[PDB]
RNA sequence: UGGUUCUAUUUUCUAGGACUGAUUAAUAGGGACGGUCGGGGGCAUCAGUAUUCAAUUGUCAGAGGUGAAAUUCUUGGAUUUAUUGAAGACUAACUACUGCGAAAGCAUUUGCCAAGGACGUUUUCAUUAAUCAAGAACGCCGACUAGGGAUCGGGUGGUGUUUUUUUAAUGACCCACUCGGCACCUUACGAGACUGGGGGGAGUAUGGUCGCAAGGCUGAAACUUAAAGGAAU
């Protein structure tokens, strides 16, 4: 499996089982930015990067507000004009959740990406 | 599958009781290698008796780099050499007694494992291409 | 010499191991004897696990010392000396004392 | 390894020159080591008592076998008993919701030959990896949380009893922890989207089609016909 996918799988089903903390290993910059944007929108609480010298561990604390993480496995390019279409086709509803993209300006959600007018490849979603 | 490996400490320093020299360790390393031990045996003897924890920490670099920069390079990597000699030991067992179908099966497994990392070492070109396992 | 069958059927219980040995020994005369031995693995007092099995290397070591010390009790006996030795069951006490270390 | 020449006391010490230059170290993977572990395999060896057969006695009329019998053996002595030999198998109880093996499978001892797994590791390499069409060898679900008791293999710690001593090392049990197994008892939470086939179960009817089936004493029909048999008596 991937390295973002099993971290998001742990952070998904741990919250489904109703835990208040996940430990996810290993940890990359893209995982830090994904948890960064989802705590910017308020889906997880704090999280902490314990640096062992191998790859890093994250302890996320998460309350109740998430209900699905994911990754879109072909990292196809989206456009600023088709951000609205891709959110319509993969989100649950109209203003429900965020598609998260790797852009020129880094990892951002879809509405921040179209706010500062930059497209990029898709990464994953959260709602 | 079991989880039984070694747990490298978080420190990257000499342990502050290691009063020996960073060069006398290298001289002991090349002495043991020239009297003829594989690098894993150098590391375990150095760890057990002259208490360097690990020599990538206490010396500059790892000990196969120390042996290659001091002139004691291996003909073939230690993994491939040990798997080669295990395969030829099973092959001599099979020529001795020819009703050991289980040992024939283990020979197929050992030969597959030979080809895997021989392919890896060949595409890295540690060992030259047109290398065959006889 | 031979046991009755009811004695060793009365000795065999499950949840233990029987270590049995035998040696073909020539005495201080020129009688050659095949002499057997049986032993059953006890459980200690305070043992709470129900098994008390031997780990089969303890079986090989126990059977080794059984063979060695009873082939030491023969060759060091004649037939009359061996018979007077195995009437009061004392080679069994020699085996027990030599094997309680294992 | 070779060669040139510079300083002060017959031999002391000296200076120079020609044959390397990125990270970890995955509760990913491989390899080494260590004490081990197992009814994993191969060869050799050893034993056991049954069974079958044979030899020798002892004694005499039956022995198997069956629901009863029978085929069979038997006064040229069966069956039973005792001593001994030979053969081919097999490894009883111990034997387990235990172990090992990729599966089929594997149970006597001892030795040799290689192998394997788990554990221990402040050893080594550094992505070498996962899945399977083809081919080769042998022959209530998952991507999922926690537990609980028991057991097998390893390790650490405790500090009592069995052990015991100046010959080597080495146990057994109790307890806690921990890793890995064969199972068992529960929990919480998830979309989990050796080839060929008619159409449900239980019945019911049939002016259709294809079959099979009745009569009526036999002999006995062209013959009112014998003997004998049947039936009822």
UniProtKB/Swiss-Prot annotation, chain A:
GO MF annotations in UniProt: structural constituent of ribosome
Compartments where found: Cytoplasm
Keywords: Cytoplasm, Ribonucleoprotein, Ribosomal protein
InterPro entries: Ribosomal_uS8, Ribosomal_uS8_CS, Ribosomal_uS8_sf
One annotated Gene Ontology cellular component of this protein: cytosolic small ribosomal subunit
GO biological process: cytoplasmic translation
Subunit structure: Component of the small ribosomal subunit (SSU). Mature yeast ribosomes consist of a small (40S) and a large (60S) subunit. The 40S small subunit contains 1 molecule of ribosomal RNA (18S rRNA) and 33 different proteins (encoded by 57 genes). The large 60S subunit contains 3 rRNA molecules (25S, 5.8S and 5S rRNA) and 46 different proteins (encoded by 81 genes).
Protein purpose: Component of the ribosome, a large ribonucleoprotein complex responsible for the synthesis of proteins in the cell. The small ribosomal subunit (SSU) binds messenger RNAs (mRNAs) and translates the encoded message by selecting cognate aminoacyl-transfer RNA (tRNA) molecules. The large subunit (LSU) contains the ribosomal catalytic site termed the peptidyl transferase center (PTC), which catalyzes the formation of peptide bonds, thereby polymerizing the amino acids delivered by tRNAs into a polypeptide chain.
Note: Present with 19700 molecules/cell in log phase SD medium. There are 2 genes for uS8 in yeast.
Family: Belongs to the universal ribosomal protein uS8 family.
Name of this protein: Small ribosomal subunit protein uS8B
Source organism of the structure: Saccharomyces cerevisiae (strain ATCC 204508 / S288c) (Baker's yeast)
Organism placement in taxonomy: Eukaryota, Fungi, Dikarya, Ascomycota, Saccharomycotina
Gene: RPS22B
Swiss-Prot record, chain B:
Keyword presence, Phosphoprotein: yes
InterPro entries, A to Z: Ribosomal_uS15, Ribosomal_uS15_arc_euk, Ribosomal_uS15_N, uS15_NS1_RNA-bd_sf
Database matches in Gene3D superfamilies: 4.10.860.130, S15/NS1, RNA-binding (1.10.287.10)
Cross-link (Glycyl lysine isopeptide (Lys-Gly) (interchain with G-Cter in ubiquitin)): 31, 35
Keywords from the named record: Cytoplasm, Isopeptide bond, Phosphoprotein, Ribonucleoprotein, Ribosomal protein, Ubl conjugation
GO biological process: cytoplasmic translation; maturation of SSU-rRNA from tricistronic rRNA transcript (SSU-rRNA, 5.8S rRNA, LSU-rRNA)
GO terms for MF: small ribosomal subunit rRNA binding; structural constituent of ribosome
GO cellular component: 90S preribosome; cytoplasm; cytosol; cytosolic small ribosomal subunit; nucleolus
PROSITE patterns given in the database record: RIBOSOMAL_S15
Location of Phosphoserine modifications: 24
SMART domains listed in its UniProt record: Ribosomal_S13_N (SM01386), Ribosomal_S15 (SM01387)
Main location: cytoplasm
Subcellular location, record wording: Cytoplasm
Family in the record: Belongs to the universal ribosomal protein uS15 family.
Role, per record: Component of the ribosome, a large ribonucleoprotein complex responsible for the synthesis of proteins in the cell. The small ribosomal subunit (SSU) binds messenger RNAs (mRNAs) and translates the encoded message by selecting cognate aminoacyl-transfer RNA (tRNA) molecules. The large subunit (LSU) contains the ribosomal catalytic site termed the peptidyl transferase center (PTC), which catalyzes the formation of peptide bonds, thereby polymerizing the amino acids delivered by tRNAs into a polypeptide chain.
PANTHER family named in the record: RIBOSOMAL PROTEIN S15P/S13E, SMALL RIBOSOMAL SUBUNIT PROTEIN US15
Description of how the protein assembles with itself and partners: Component of the small ribosomal subunit (SSU). Mature yeast ribosomes consist of a small (40S) and a large (60S) subunit. The 40S small subunit contains 1 molecule of ribosomal RNA (18S rRNA) and 33 different proteins (encoded by 57 genes). The large 60S subunit contains 3 rRNA molecules (25S, 5.8S and 5S rRNA) and 46 different proteins (encoded by 81 genes).
Protein name: Small ribosomal subunit protein uS15
Organism phylogeny: Eukaryota, Fungi, Dikarya, Ascomycota, Saccharomycotina
From Swiss-Prot, chain C:
Keyword tags: Acetylation, Cytoplasm, Isopeptide bond, Phosphoprotein, Ribonucleoprotein, Ribosomal protein, Ubl conjugation
Residue ranges that the Swiss-Prot or TrEMBL entry lists as coiled coil: none
Gene Ontology CC annotation, any one: cytosol
One GO term of the biological process aspect: maturation of SSU-rRNA from tricistronic rRNA transcript (SSU-rRNA, 5.8S rRNA, LSU-rRNA)
Entry annotated with the keyword Phosphoprotein: yes
Major localization class: cytoplasm
PTM comment, free text: N-terminally acetylated by acetyltransferase NatA.
Transmembrane segments: none
Localization annotation: Cytoplasm
Gene Ontology MF: a single term: structural constituent of ribosome
Subunit structure: Component of the small ribosomal subunit (SSU). Mature yeast ribosomes consist of a small (40S) and a large (60S) subunit. The 40S small subunit contains 1 molecule of ribosomal RNA (18S rRNA) and 33 different proteins (encoded by 57 genes). The large 60S subunit contains 3 rRNA molecules (25S, 5.8S and 5S rRNA) and 46 different proteins (encoded by 81 genes). eS1 interacts directly with uS11 and eS26, which form part of the mRNA exit tunnel.
Misc. remarks from the entry: Present with 92400 molecules/cell in log phase SD medium. There are 2 genes for eS1 in yeast.
The family this protein is said to belong to: Belongs to the eukaryotic ribosomal protein eS1 family.
Summary of the function given for this chain in its UniProt record: Component of the ribosome, a large ribonucleoprotein complex responsible for the synthesis of proteins in the cell. The small ribosomal subunit (SSU) binds messenger RNAs (mRNAs) and translates the encoded message by selecting cognate aminoacyl-transfer RNA (tRNA) molecules. The large subunit (LSU) contains the ribosomal catalytic site termed the peptidyl transferase center (PTC), which catalyzes the formation of peptide bonds, thereby polymerizing the amino acids delivered by tRNAs into a polypeptide chain.
Name of the featured protein: Small ribosomal subunit protein eS1A
Taxonomic source organism: Saccharomyces cerevisiae (strain ATCC 204508 / S288c)
Lineage of the organism: Eukaryota, Fungi, Dikarya, Ascomycota, Saccharomycotina
Protein encoded by which gene: RPS1A
Entire-sequence positions represented here: 103 to 204 of 255
